[PDB]
Design an enzyme around this catalytic site. Structure first.
Site, PDB file in Angstrom:
ATOM      1  N   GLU A 117      -6.126  10.784  20.889  1.00  0.00           N
ATOM      2  CA  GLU A 117      -7.469  10.855  20.460  1.00  0.00           C
ATOM      3  C   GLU A 117      -7.974  11.958  19.622  1.00  0.00           C
ATOM      4  O   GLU A 117      -7.772  13.033  20.196  1.00  0.00           O
ATOM      5  CB  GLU A 117      -8.776  10.100  21.312  1.00  0.00           C
ATOM      6  CG  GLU A 117      -9.913   9.822  20.505  1.00  0.00           C
ATOM      7  CD  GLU A 117     -11.284   9.261  21.431  1.00  0.00           C
ATOM      8  OE1 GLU A 117     -10.924   9.311  22.540  1.00  0.00           O
ATOM      9  OE2 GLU A 117     -12.013   8.799  20.576  1.00  0.00           O
ATOM     10  N   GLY A 257     -13.191  17.319  27.555  1.00  0.00           N
ATOM     11  CA  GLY A 257     -13.565  17.227  28.996  1.00  0.00           C
ATOM     12  C   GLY A 257     -12.633  16.185  29.823  1.00  0.00           C
ATOM     13  O   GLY A 257     -11.952  16.599  30.823  1.00  0.00           O
ATOM     14  N   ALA A 258     -12.457  15.175  29.105  1.00  0.00           N
ATOM     15  CA  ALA A 258     -11.752  13.969  29.638  1.00  0.00           C
ATOM     16  C   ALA A 258     -11.394  13.079  28.604  1.00  0.00           C
ATOM     17  O   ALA A 258     -12.070  12.913  27.792  1.00  0.00           O
ATOM     18  CB  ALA A 258     -12.261  13.562  31.102  1.00  0.00           C
ATOM     19  N   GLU A 260     -10.092   8.494  28.208  1.00  0.00           N
ATOM     20  CA  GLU A 260     -10.315   7.236  28.977  1.00  0.00           C
ATOM     21  C   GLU A 260      -8.869   6.515  28.453  1.00  0.00           C
ATOM     22  O   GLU A 260      -8.703   5.239  28.722  1.00  0.00           O
ATOM     23  CB  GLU A 260     -11.225   6.650  28.405  1.00  0.00           C
ATOM     24  CG  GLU A 260     -11.309   6.290  26.941  1.00  0.00           C
ATOM     25  CD  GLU A 260     -11.845   7.086  25.834  1.00  0.00           C
ATOM     26  OE1 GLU A 260     -11.903   8.207  26.220  1.00  0.00           O
ATOM     27  OE2 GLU A 260     -12.315   6.566  24.804  1.00  0.00           O
ATOM     28  N   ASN A 261      -7.537   7.198  28.462  1.00  0.00           N
ATOM     29  CA  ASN A 261      -6.481   6.634  28.167  1.00  0.00           C
ATOM     30  C   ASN A 261      -6.399   5.342  29.104  1.00  0.00           C
ATOM     31  O   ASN A 261      -6.457   5.419  30.392  1.00  0.00           O
ATOM     32  CB  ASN A 261      -5.097   7.222  28.329  1.00  0.00           C
ATOM     33  CG  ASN A 261      -5.456   8.746  27.504  1.00  0.00           C
ATOM     34  OD1 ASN A 261      -5.300   8.730  26.296  1.00  0.00           O
ATOM     35  ND2 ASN A 261      -5.439   9.674  28.347  1.00  0.00           N
ATOM     36  N   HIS A 293     -17.967   8.324  33.041  1.00  0.00           N
ATOM     37  CA  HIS A 293     -18.113   8.089  31.516  1.00  0.00           C
ATOM     38  C   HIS A 293     -16.382   7.534  31.442  1.00  0.00           C
ATOM     39  O   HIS A 293     -16.544   6.701  30.439  1.00  0.00           O
ATOM     40  CB  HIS A 293     -18.113   9.394  31.031  1.00  0.00           C
ATOM     41  CG  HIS A 293     -18.234   9.357  29.491  1.00  0.00           C
ATOM     42  ND1 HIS A 293     -19.272   9.422  28.600  1.00  0.00           N
ATOM     43  CD2 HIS A 293     -17.131   9.475  28.430  1.00  0.00           C
ATOM     44  CE1 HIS A 293     -19.051   9.342  27.394  1.00  0.00           C
ATOM     45  NE2 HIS A 293     -17.535   9.289  27.213  1.00  0.00           N
ATOM     46  N   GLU A 294     -15.557   8.342  31.918  1.00  0.00           N
ATOM     47  CA  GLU A 294     -14.377   7.746  31.559  1.00  0.00           C
ATOM     48  C   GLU A 294     -14.074   6.352  32.005  1.00  0.00           C
ATOM     49  O   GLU A 294     -13.381   5.305  31.418  1.00  0.00           O
ATOM     50  CB  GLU A 294     -13.081   8.828  31.722  1.00  0.00           C
ATOM     51  CG  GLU A 294     -13.285  10.094  31.598  1.00  0.00           C
ATOM     52  CD  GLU A 294     -13.652  10.357  29.824  1.00  0.00           C
ATOM     53  OE1 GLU A 294     -13.413   9.278  29.046  1.00  0.00           O
ATOM     54  OE2 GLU A 294     -14.139  11.216  29.613  1.00  0.00           O
ATOM     55  N   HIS A 297     -15.398   3.530  29.821  1.00  0.00           N
ATOM     56  CA  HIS A 297     -14.812   3.254  28.600  1.00  0.00           C
ATOM     57  C   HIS A 297     -14.161   2.142  28.887  1.00  0.00           C
ATOM     58  O   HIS A 297     -13.267   1.581  27.825  1.00  0.00           O
ATOM     59  CB  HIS A 297     -14.279   4.710  28.229  1.00  0.00           C
ATOM     60  CG  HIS A 297     -14.857   5.513  27.226  1.00  0.00           C
ATOM     61  ND1 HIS A 297     -15.576   5.005  25.925  1.00  0.00           N
ATOM     62  CD2 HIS A 297     -15.147   6.761  27.377  1.00  0.00           C
ATOM     63  CE1 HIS A 297     -15.826   6.149  25.420  1.00  0.00           C
ATOM     64  NE2 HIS A 297     -15.747   7.224  26.125  1.00  0.00           N
ATOM     65  N   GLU A 316     -19.103   5.684  22.045  1.00  0.00           N
ATOM     66  CA  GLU A 316     -19.551   6.978  22.413  1.00  0.00           C
ATOM     67  C   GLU A 316     -20.931   6.970  23.013  1.00  0.00           C
ATOM     68  O   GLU A 316     -21.586   7.368  24.031  1.00  0.00           O
ATOM     69  CB  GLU A 316     -19.097   8.400  21.800  1.00  0.00           C
ATOM     70  CG  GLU A 316     -17.702   8.410  21.735  1.00  0.00           C
ATOM     71  CD  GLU A 316     -16.975   8.461  23.125  1.00  0.00           C
ATOM     72  OE1 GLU A 316     -17.553   8.910  24.074  1.00  0.00           O
ATOM     73  OE2 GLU A 316     -15.693   8.391  22.853  1.00  0.00           O
TER      74      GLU A 316
HETATM   75  C1  LIG Z   1     -17.266  13.083  28.784  1.00  0.00           C
HETATM   76  N1  LIG Z   1     -18.891  12.986  28.559  1.00  0.00           N
HETATM   77  C2  LIG Z   1     -19.586  12.588  30.009  1.00  0.00           C
HETATM   78  C3  LIG Z   1     -19.595  13.452  27.295  1.00  0.00           C
HETATM   79  N2  LIG Z   1     -20.724  13.481  27.540  1.00  0.00           N
HETATM   80  C4  LIG Z   1     -21.632  13.830  26.439  1.00  0.00           C
HETATM   81  N3  LIG Z   1     -20.930  14.315  25.493  1.00  0.00           N
HETATM   82  C5  LIG Z   1     -19.585  14.557  25.415  1.00  0.00           C
HETATM   83  C6  LIG Z   1     -18.903  14.321  26.516  1.00  0.00           C
HETATM   84  N4  LIG Z   1     -17.490  14.403  26.148  1.00  0.00           N
HETATM   85  C7  LIG Z   1     -17.511  14.910  25.141  1.00  0.00           C
HETATM   86  N5  LIG Z   1     -18.939  15.013  24.562  1.00  0.00           N
HETATM   87  C8  LIG Z   1     -19.500  15.653  23.292  1.00  0.00           C
HETATM   88  O1  LIG Z   1     -18.467  16.307  22.797  1.00  0.00           O
HETATM   89  C9  LIG Z   1     -18.780  17.520  22.844  1.00  0.00           C
HETATM   90  C10 LIG Z   1     -18.077  18.873  23.527  1.00  0.00           C
HETATM   91  O2  LIG Z   1     -19.030  19.989  23.201  1.00  0.00           O
HETATM   92  C11 LIG Z   1     -20.252  17.770  23.320  1.00  0.00           C
HETATM   93  N6  LIG Z   1     -20.876  18.200  22.164  1.00  0.00           N
HETATM   94  C12 LIG Z   1     -20.592  16.463  23.610  1.00  0.00           C
HETATM   95  O3  LIG Z   1     -21.902  16.139  23.532  1.00  0.00           O
HETATM   96  C1  LIG Z   2      -9.200  15.961  21.029  1.00  0.00           C
HETATM   97  O1  LIG Z   2      -9.022  15.435  22.202  1.00  0.00           O
HETATM   98  C2  LIG Z   2     -10.113  14.622  22.752  1.00  0.00           C
HETATM   99  C3  LIG Z   2     -10.945  14.080  21.893  1.00  0.00           C
HETATM  100  C4  LIG Z   2     -11.900  13.216  22.164  1.00  0.00           C
HETATM  101  C5  LIG Z   2     -12.278  13.131  23.675  1.00  0.00           C
HETATM  102  C6  LIG Z   2     -13.346  12.530  24.150  1.00  0.00           C
HETATM  103  C7  LIG Z   2     -13.160  11.333  25.094  1.00  0.00           C
HETATM  104  N1  LIG Z   2     -12.793  10.010  24.458  1.00  0.00           N
HETATM  105  C8  LIG Z   2     -14.502  10.904  25.842  1.00  0.00           C
HETATM  106  O2  LIG Z   2     -15.478  10.316  25.065  1.00  0.00           O
HETATM  107  O3  LIG Z   2     -14.840  11.593  26.789  1.00  0.00           O
HETATM  108  C9  LIG Z   2     -11.326  13.761  24.565  1.00  0.00           C
HETATM  109  C10 LIG Z   2     -10.245  14.508  23.942  1.00  0.00           C
HETATM  110 ZN   LIG Z   3     -16.534   8.990  25.700  1.00  0.00          ZN
END
Ligand SMILES: CN(C)c1ncnc2c1ncn2[C@@H]1O[C@H](CO)[C@@H](N)[C@H]1O
Ligand SMILES: COc1ccc(C[C@H](N)C(=O)O)cc1
Ligand SMILES: [Zn+2]
Length: 866
Positions: A117, A257-258, A260-261, A293-294, A297, A316
């Site tokens: 992603e 952060g993580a 959702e594959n 969260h993941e 998804h 999202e």
């Molecule tokens: C993974 N989860 C719980 C998220 N929850 C809220 N915002 C997120 C998340 N994962 C990514 N984002 C958004 O992408 C950005 C990384 O700083 C954050 N702005 C965040 O709001």
């Molecule tokens: C560039 O690498 C990434 C991009 C987007 C995510 C966010 C994930 N779908 C989520 O909403 O947590 C994760 C990685």
């Molecule tokens: Zn997400």
């Protein structure tokens, strides 16, 4: 780098229904074979246009005929003269070891893993890398068995074998059609925590958490939280897991952060690994929320996906809403709501007032990885929450059910979701849709009148959204405006008009309107925008006594907190103006008394007390000002802490001691008490030096968990206590081999109030626990300096900007996604005074001139410099 526009969406000329991938894996050279079954939907003469980046093309066949009618161009392989239905075979090579951007297939330590992603799959093979192309995947992975004993992809294992020269292979199949952004591959040597979850209808799911060797001791909480997520989604939303195996892999090198594959989530290890000596309460609760969260998804993103990237918030906003509802139901609702409002008002509003402002459904994007934003996520969720406010739970769940009935197995749009909610509920959301297309924060102005002759209370409410750099035209929104009215004993006054009840969610839909309430027998105290019912700035001329009345009497915990924030905002603004004139802090006695009352009230939930006793952050404070004075804000925040520390010393120490806990538990009542204890410790750290030094050093050495240890450490740094340097060296000596634990220490270094913070930060680029190759270390040192020490970042000498330019000059080449997050503080230049603005503009112009400037940075720099 050309902009793409939402209005330019068109259905794809070709679909791919099925793809069989084979990976001959090796860190220096991986060979990918991709066999796709394609179907033409467009015009018979249209070529197939495949996206690809940094691929070495080996061959192209069409029904096993070597093809001649193709050409490579920038970003693309364009294949001509095709049949209506055919098998495409591409062989190409990629180099994981070279991939410092962490996009596509890359190396994390000794493991190989993917991030696809938004548009990373095109870094693996030539493909229709768009989320409205949904294909059934089968993935065969061939690798060295010693190096890569675990070979993972989405779904279930269908085949496996061993080969000569120490190689082996595993083939996976996932029955559900997916867009390629949900493909994943992992190969490595791991410890594996294995468990089971049985769904409410009896499906047994194998749960498998993959961690680096020696990390099993840190895995059980993440597994607990996965199970909790699955139960909750069943109970609240009626949704069950749809596969047989749920795999999570924790990797050390990850930009976000993580991810959702489907059936194979890939997580930054920050959001998996926890044990009581390494992780704080907030780490535990963040793991919980990210695991949730993941998992959420799986339905909101995977079973229903996005037609196009401009629809990102469709998954999202809704999945953040779900993660917030999960945390709120399991834990403290009010603490959750409070913290999400602090993020909205302190971080999101800044974005909405910036050059990068955008609607939750963007209209224009250059680099889609720049649109994973506070806006799309957190404002997105506020928009979903507004639908929930307007509909109620029951009608909102009927909307969810209709959304999945209509759209399961498809790529849908935001408009589809809103239609589902309107159709299920019979609530009209036509005006409401403007929240998707309009950027910027609405300002809601409220005047009130009480007429004792007629016993009527009238609210006059106006709205406007100021223009933003992206949109010159604004129009009124449909703003759900929740109120409550209180009599002088603190009892709620029934809302009515003309003999009938009136709903307490007012529909504020015009630029100006009045709301009249009858049978108001006493002049009320209003609670306005209850539970932050719409993501807006409120302007109401509060008296101090109305606010302290709410702190004592408001029925919802959030309102009591919010009233405390309104009371502090007046005095933060007063004292920033005073600081600019070189005058000391001034605070009415009656304001301190209201916080004393909160300390001594035995009836208040400790979770709520703690939050009232947590001052707004320097980012929240900045939101109160048109022009930000970062040094004044930081120093006022410290001075306000010191004033309250002196005025409340005895009460603070009493409540500190009263909330001592000998047993450490990750349980919400226990967390609440600890948060209150440590909220008191922040003020006590600004007591008389010798008292504070002893109290803080004692907590650091006697703590039996990292929450308490780190609270002490952070207090020693914030108050520059004598024990600071020794405690900081103690921590480094203990924890230097543990990068996740060291991140906390880097944040403390970077956010230090010490005069020599920049020198210290620069020297930490050479620290044994720091490396520019790891996004978490970069965020924790460099990011926290630029973003969370606005006072040192905006040093008048300009040194903070110069430092960031140096780091961005590296990162632009190394890891543009991380670079783009780190440039944010410079893009806010028009919020600062002219001298700072000129220095920040010079820095941006330096970056604009880099060789090989990334699209990620280019997008932001050109908006900033406009
Ligand atoms: C993974 N989860 C719980 C998220 N929850 C809220 N915002 C997120 C998340 N994962 C990514 N984002 C958004 O992408 C950005 C990384 O700083 C954050 N702005 C965040 O709001
Ligand atoms: C560039 O690498 C990434 C991009 C987007 C995510 C966010 C994930 N779908 C989520 O909403 O947590 C994760 C990685
Ligand atoms: Zn997400």
């Amino acid at each position: 780098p050309q902009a793409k526009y939402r209005h330019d969406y068109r259905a794809p000329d070709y679909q791919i229904t099925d793809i069989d991938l084979t990976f001959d894996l090796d860190a220096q050279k991986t060979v990918v074979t991709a066999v796709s079954q394609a179907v033409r939907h467009g015009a018979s003469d249209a070529p197939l246009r495949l996206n690809g980046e940094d691929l070495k093309l080996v061959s192209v066949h069409i029904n096993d005929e070597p093809w001649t009618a193709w050409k490579e161009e920038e970003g693309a392989l364009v294949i001509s003269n095709l049949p209506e239905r055919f098998t495409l075979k591409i062989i190409n090579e990629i180099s994981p070891a070279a991939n410092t951007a962490l996009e596509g297939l890359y190396q994390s330590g000794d493991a190989l893993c993917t991030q696809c992603e938004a548009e990373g799959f095109r870094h693996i093979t030539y493909y229709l890398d768009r989320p409205d192309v949904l294909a059934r995947f089968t993935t065969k992975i061939i690798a060295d068995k010693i190096k890569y004993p675990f070979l993972l992809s989405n779904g279930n294992r269908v085949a496996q074998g061993e080969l000569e020269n120490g190689r082996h292979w595993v083939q996976w199949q996932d029955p559900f059609p997916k867009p390629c952004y949900l493909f994943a591959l992992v190969a490595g040597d791991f410890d594996v925590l294995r468990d089971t979850f049985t769904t409410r209808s009896g499906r047994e799911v194998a749960l498998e958490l993959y961690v680096d060797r020696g990390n099993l001791d840190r895995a059980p909480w993440a597994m607990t939280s996965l199970k909790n997520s699955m139960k909750w989604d069943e109970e609240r939303f009626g949704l069950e897991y749809d596969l047989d195996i749920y795999m999570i892999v924790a990797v050390d090198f990850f930009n976000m952060g993580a991810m959702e594959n489907k059936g194979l989530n890939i997580f930054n290890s920050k959001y998996v690994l926890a044990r009581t000596d390494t992780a704080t309460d907030k780490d535990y609760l963040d793991i919980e929320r990210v695991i949730g969260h993941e998992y959420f998804h799986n339905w909101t993103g995977n079973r229903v996906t996005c037609r196009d990237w401009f629809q990102l918030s469709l998954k999202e906003g809704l999945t953040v809403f779900r993660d917030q509802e999960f945390s709120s139901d399991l834990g403290s609702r009010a603490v959750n709501r409070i913290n999400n409002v602090r993020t909205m008002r302190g971080l999101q509003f800044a974005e909405d007032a910036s050059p990068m402002a955008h609607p939750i459904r963007p209209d224009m994007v250059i680099e889609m990885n720049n649109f994973y934003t506070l806006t799309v996520y957190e404002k997105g969720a506020e928009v979903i929450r507004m639908i929930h406010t307007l509909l109620g739970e029951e009608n909102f769940q009927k909307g969810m059910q209709l959304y999945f009935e209509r759209h399961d197995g498809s790529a849908a749009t935001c408009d589809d979701f809103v239609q589902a909610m309107e159709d299920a509920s019979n609530v009209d959301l036509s005006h409401f849709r403007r929240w998707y297309s309009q950027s910027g924060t609405p300002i809601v102005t409220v005047k009130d009148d009480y007429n004792p002759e007629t016993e009527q209370y009238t609210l006059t409410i106006s709205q406007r959204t100021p223009a933003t750099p992206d949109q010159a035209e604004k129009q009124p929104l449909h703003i759900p405006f929740a109120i409550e009215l209180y009599d002088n004993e603190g009892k709620v006054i029934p809302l009515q008009k003309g003999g009938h009840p009136v709903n307490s969610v007012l529909n504020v839909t015009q630029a100006e309107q009045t709301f009249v309430f009858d049978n108001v027998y006493f002049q009320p105290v209003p609670a306005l925008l209850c539970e932050f019912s719409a993501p807006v700035k409120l302007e109401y001329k509060w008296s101090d006594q109305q606010l302290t009345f709410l702190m004592r009497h408001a029925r919802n915990d959030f309102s009591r907190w919010d009233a405390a924030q309104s009371l502090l905002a007046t005095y933060i603004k007063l004292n920033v103006a005073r600081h600019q004139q070189g005058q000391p802090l001034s605070l009415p006695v009656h304001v301190a008394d209201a916080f004393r009352a909160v300390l001594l009230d035995e009836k208040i939930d400790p979770a709520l007390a703690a939050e009232i006793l947590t001052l707004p952050s320097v980012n929240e404070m900045a939101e109160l000002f048109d022009i930000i004075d970062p040094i004044a804000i930081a120093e006022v925040r410290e001075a306000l802490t010191r004033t309250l520390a002196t005025e409340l010393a005895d009460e603070l120490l009493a409540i500190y001691n009263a909330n001592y806990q000998s047993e450490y538990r990750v349980e919400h009542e226990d967390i609440a008490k600890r948060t209150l204890r440590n909220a008191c410790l922040r003020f006590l750290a600004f007591g008389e030096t010798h008292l504070a030094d002893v109290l803080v050093s004692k907590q650091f050495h006697e703590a039996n968990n990292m929450t308490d240890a780190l609270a002490a450490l952070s207090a020693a740094v914030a108050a520059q206590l004598p024990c600071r340097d020794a405690l900081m060296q103690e921590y480094d000596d203990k924890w230097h081999q543990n990068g996740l634990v060291m991140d906390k220490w880097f944040i403390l270094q970077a956010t230090s109030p010490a005069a020599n913070v920049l020198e210290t930060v620069r020297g930490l680029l050479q620290h044994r626990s720091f490396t520019m190759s790891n996004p978490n270390r970069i965020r924790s040192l460099i990011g926290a300096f630029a973003g969370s020490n606005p006072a040192a970042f905006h040093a008048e000498d300009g040194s903070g900007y110069l430092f960031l330019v140096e780091m961005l000059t590296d990162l632009n080449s190394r890891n543009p996604q991380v670079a783009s997050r780190l440039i944010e503080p410079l893009i806010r230049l028009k919020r600062y005074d002219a001298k700072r603005q000129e220095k920040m503009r010079a820095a941006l112009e330096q970056l604009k001139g880099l060789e090989n400037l990334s699209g990620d940075l280019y997008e932001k720099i050109t908006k900033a410099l406009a």
